[PDB]
Ligand binder design. Structure first.
Ligand SMILES: NC(=O)c1ccc[n+]([C@@H]2O[C@H](COP(=O)([O-])OP(=O)(O)OC[C@H]3O[C@@H](n4cnc5c(N)ncnc54)[C@H](O)[C@@H]3O)[C@@H](O)[C@H]2O)c1
Ligand SMILES: NC(=O)c1ccc[n+]([C@@H]2O[C@H](COP(=O)([O-])OP(=O)(O)OC[C@H]3O[C@@H](n4cnc5c(N)ncnc54)[C@H](O)[C@@H]3O)[C@@H](O)[C@H]2O)c1
Ligand SMILES: NC(=O)c1ccc[n+]([C@@H]2O[C@H](COP(=O)([O-])OP(=O)(O)OC[C@H]3O[C@@H](n4cnc5c(N)ncnc54)[C@H](O)[C@@H]3O)[C@@H](O)[C@H]2O)c1
Ligand SMILES: NC(=O)c1ccc[n+]([C@@H]2O[C@H](COP(=O)([O-])OP(=O)(O)OC[C@H]3O[C@@H](n4cnc5c(N)ncnc54)[C@H](O)[C@@H]3O)[C@@H](O)[C@H]2O)c1
Ligand SMILES: Cc1ccc2nc(C(=O)c3ccc(F)c(O)c3)ccc2c1
Ligand SMILES: Cc1ccc2nc(C(=O)c3ccc(F)c(O)c3)ccc2c1
Ligand SMILES: Cc1ccc2nc(C(=O)c3ccc(F)c(O)c3)ccc2c1
Ligand SMILES: Cc1ccc2nc(C(=O)c3ccc(F)c(O)c3)ccc2c1
Ligand SMILES: OC[C@H]1O[C@@H](O)[C@H](O)[C@@H](O)[C@@H]1O
Ligand SMILES: OC[C@H]1O[C@@H](O)[C@H](O)[C@@H](O)[C@@H]1O
Ligand SMILES: OC[C@H]1O[C@@H](O)[C@H](O)[C@@H](O)[C@@H]1O
Ligand SMILES: OC[C@H]1O[C@@H](O)[C@H](O)[C@@H](O)[C@@H]1O
Ligand code: NA
Ligand code: NA
Ligand code: NA
Ligand code: NA
Lengths: 253, 253, 253, 253
């Protein structure tokens, strides 16, 4: 009952972290709108979860997002929390192999899609004293190899979260982000499968954490439910869900 | 039921943030040992809360802490979480008014008391796959005026949390900290009362947060229950409970 | 002589921080290419400074940047340091007053212009074991009110700096950023002039720093010369030039 | 001539990083007082460097530090910069192998010695508009394995630097810290020699940095001269000299 009576939109909710966040909110008593550009996972999740419904929406398309918000309000009468989870990590790319074109496309998804939904949702979040949760990335803070565009987009999300928290504080709307590290999801599996030795890549990904494993969508979901339902004095925070990966680390020429 | 069957020790649990943490854990289903050097608040809290008991213990006294741990195990049979909350903020002091003697005394409480209980508790936390929660301070990260010793002690706590998280990760024990900002507690009230215009000082303390108020012990308590019970992929994190105080901020000579 | 024989490109070098960086590098013995989209300041600076030349270049235009690099190499035979300083802060804008269109345009300048020049320069920086210096912003790290797009762009720059530092480390190219706070420049003067009480706004800007004044272009310039010429074990750092602005900060409802 | 006419005290200046800092300041034109508890290195350094003199002083002994300051003023007539470099890293120690006694002793050196000299020097630094430079450690920020006391002491130093910067800003005294990573010094060599395979330990220490080597005392020294002589808008900063070590990092159970 921690979030009973509330209405939550989760973008990219059809699989991976997003689906874990959907499940955590349904388990907390909320009604959840699953937004995804892909019908397969999200439609099945609606059938599985009473309290969740699926709305096809590509967050890079402004009119899709307008309809997502208007349909959420039409169907459920309020909006309490937006979780901006839709995002992508390209395959590893050396800096000279990236392009401004690809960088712009990744900004459209990872940054501007979050911006667009948040902007359209904020009038309703102000009415409900609701909150925004952005899914950023640990590597926005610490960097990652072979990922210049991705890292830039996530540094932008974390910073934007802090700016918006300042602007929306007088109106009672909290704005926070979660920065996951290595979470075992279909994206992780897909990227590993591109590598010469996928099993070795996966093993390395597990050992990057002091805890010796990758994280689960459910663990990101629990962090999101905490931020929405019990973190009433938290705004503009970056909540790390990383298993400790950021901890620790002639001869001098 | 989020933490049912678990046993938690909260130091400085007789009033303020510590009492809020005690209440949050009792509400989650845990049994709680209230440690305090002062009988008044903690004894009343035991009477009030089924599931909480009071043990007199000054965390700066090694034998008191040894007895705290042995009595917790004798009475409850396990130990799952230690919350190192006991600590103090001296009245505002200019650097030249501080002393090495006073600095050492504050280190004994704010830093070494946390170290001592954690060390004595860790064998039991390893058996239960339990966790440590240290109550640090936002100003350990960002500084504060007229508080050189206090700030130093809290920078030490936050750093120590990260080091211990690394060391205890192979054993399945997570170690995290909460960094509160301005929380309305008897300590805050006592410090304000020393100032020339206490009401003005309190007003200034409220407006230091974008949220326009100070935080509550209950909000720190909810963050602690989250870290203990649902943050299984979080270790070595600093969870800010500050209301956004860290956000934002000839002419050039 | 600290940077004698070296060749430096400074974008946005015609006024403000960029001109201060140009002067600092000329004073260190380097030859400097002043890039700017505006001829007025940069052309005068060339006439004033032996060792500096002006090249008209809008960093948002890929062909302009290609020509900037090819002309630098044609005229000077090497390239040792790129300082990505061109950038803009829009007038204060509430989140609901911003647009995706304006956000994209600001990303083109503050983020993608930095990306584009860095990419085109890197083959030459690898040959010289040179370095990249990005001018980010303190508010990328801590947030700012009425500046969601700006803050996002600068969070991206700081993060991108760390990612590129990782990628270019095997090749001996260091990549660092400077995050200024309030620096008294024509941009600051222009933004203040839009406000109802410009003098009051300027006074507030000075008092945001514990040092009680704004910074100077020359101080950012000295930090840049340090990073280029003497910081050989620094890569991926964020060097704050802020005057301490990030330091420090019923009642509980 | 960057720091000509100025007087600098470097603690632990007889070898390692401290000796590198001494050399960098002498090369900048300053007169330097080498403080050390060990005569061997510091006495030889005085003989070698015109402009440097050696004063025997154990920074944990208050009367030694009082004499250090009074002798500096008696001999040189002013004091412009204090570099608190004396410190120690114990051999790797598991948390259960540490003691409160050893922790207190390490606090006396790494934290309280810095506090004591700074306090005694500040009246003179206010007269000269001088500055304080504390040598902290990257692992104060990110943690390290088998080093709970050390990490705590360095977290305290970094935090204390920020608090004192706030307090001394109205008086025109800047207070900054440098956080080195792996620097090749006699301490590093001594710790490696205790390990089963010292050469393997050294190799691992080099590869912890993206730059693929450890740092040099001279590089820390250049950062110190920058902070003293050219960073006039920097106070309360943590300048990382780490080679990038902090950058970057069933399957989910
Ligand atoms: N998996 C990790 O290790 C990891 C680490 C750090 C951060 N993250 C972040 O977590 C989020 C989720 O990652 P994941 O691993 O679950 O990814 P995933 O690819 O498994 O799932 C992403 C989901 O988002 C949907 N989506 C993609 N583009 C969309 C669009 N334009 N509109 C709507 N939906 C869209 C996909 O169809 C998919 O269902 C992303 O923001 C990612 O950057 C993931
Ligand atoms: N109140 C704030 O704004 C604030 C802000 C940041 C951090 N904190 C931290 O939160 C913690 C609690 O602060 P608070 O405001 O509730 O303080 P408080 O003074 O109201 O309560 C502290 C409690 O700890 C007990 N205690 C003190 N010394 C002890 C000792 N040696 N052994 C055992 N118990 C001892 C006291 O008797 C008291 O019951 C402290 O670590 C403090 O530094 C508080
Ligand atoms: N002034 C501050 O307080 C402050 C604070 C933090 C960061 N910064 C950053 O410092 C940098 C310089 O700021 P400033 O205050 O000196 O600004 P400014 O407006 O005074 O100077 C910027 C210069 O860049 C040039 N420029 C703008 N767009 C360009 C383009 N497309 N191509 C090439 N040149 C272009 C302008 O013509 C101008 O000469 C910017 O990145 C800014 O975001 C400034
Ligand atoms: N070497 C590294 O990798 C490294 C990394 C991070 C931080 N640091 C810090 O840099 C500083 C210097 O380290 P180093 O590697 O050069 O060490 P080092 O042991 O080589 O040199 C330390 C010097 O300080 C002196 N000293 C020790 N105790 C003293 C006391 N009580 N009073 C006066 N002088 C005293 C020693 O005699 C010696 O000359 C320390 O604060 C250390 O924690 C070093
Ligand atoms: C082969 C490969 C490369 C890079 C990958 N990166 C991620 C990722 O998104 C991520 C990971 C850790 C972080 F700390 C983080 O912030 C993000 C996932 C799978 C990968 C697979
Ligand atoms: C007159 C006064 C002065 C300083 C005080 N400081 C605190 C405190 O402990 C605290 C506050 C904010 C933080 F961000 C923080 O980390 C700690 C409480 C009451 C005070 C009253
Ligand atoms: C009226 C106004 C509003 C906002 C302004 N902001 C800046 C700026 O660029 C900046 C400032 C501080 C920082 F810490 C920072 O990172 C950036 C300059 C002038 C302004 C004038
Ligand atoms: C065998 C061993 C173990 C640990 C050591 N640690 C240091 C050290 O002081 C240090 C290193 C990196 C940092 F990032 C840092 O902050 C400090 C030096 C030698 C060592 C040798
Ligand atoms: O594909 C990797 C993992 O992705 C997660 O989102 C699913 O919940 C797991 O069942 C699956 O093993
Ligand atoms: O004394 C200030 C506040 O302290 C808190 O710990 C109590 O829960 C409040 O009831 C009280 O108003
Ligand atoms: O316009 C504000 C300031 O801008 C700086 O870039 C110039 O160097 C100053 O002379 C001027 O006062
Ligand atoms: O002992 C390791 C290193 O220590 C440094 O302080 C010295 O300057 C080097 O010559 C020496 O190789
Ligand atoms: Na359903
Ligand atoms: Na009871
Ligand atoms: Na010229
Ligand atoms: Na000499």
């Amino acid at each position: 009952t921690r979030y009973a009576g509330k209405v939550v939109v989760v973008t990219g909710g059809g699989r991976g972290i997003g689906a874990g966040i959907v499940r955590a909110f349904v388990n907390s008593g909320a009604r959840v709108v699953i937004c995804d550009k892909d019908e397969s996972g999200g439609r099945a999740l609606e059938q599985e979860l009473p309290g969740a419904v699926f709305i096809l929406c590509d967050v890079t398309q402004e009119d899709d997002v307008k309809t997502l918000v208007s349909e959420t309000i039409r169907r459920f009468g309020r909006l309490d929390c937006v979780v901006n989870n839709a995002g992508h990590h390209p395959p590893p790319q050396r800096p000279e192999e990236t392009s401004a074109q690809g960088f712009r496309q990744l900004l459209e998804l990872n940054l501007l899609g979050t911006y667009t939904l948040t902007k359209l949702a904020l009038p309703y979040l102000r009415k409900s004293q609701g909150n925004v949760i952005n899914i950023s990335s640990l590597v926005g803070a610490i960097g990652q190899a072979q990922a210049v565009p991705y890292v830039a987009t996530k540094g932008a999300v974390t910073a934007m979260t802090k700016a918006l928290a300042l602007d929306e504080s007088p109106y009672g709307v909290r704005v926070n982000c979660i920065s996951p590290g290595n979470i075992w999801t279909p994206l992780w599996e897909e990227l590993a499968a591109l590598m010469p030795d996928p099993r070795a890549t996966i093993r390395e990904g597990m050992l990057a954490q002091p805890l010796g494993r990758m994280g689960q969508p459910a663990e990101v979901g629990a962090a999101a439910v905490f931020l929405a339902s019990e973190a009433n004095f938290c705004t503009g925070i970056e909540l790390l869900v990383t298993g400790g990966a950021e901890l620790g680390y002639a001869p001098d020429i």
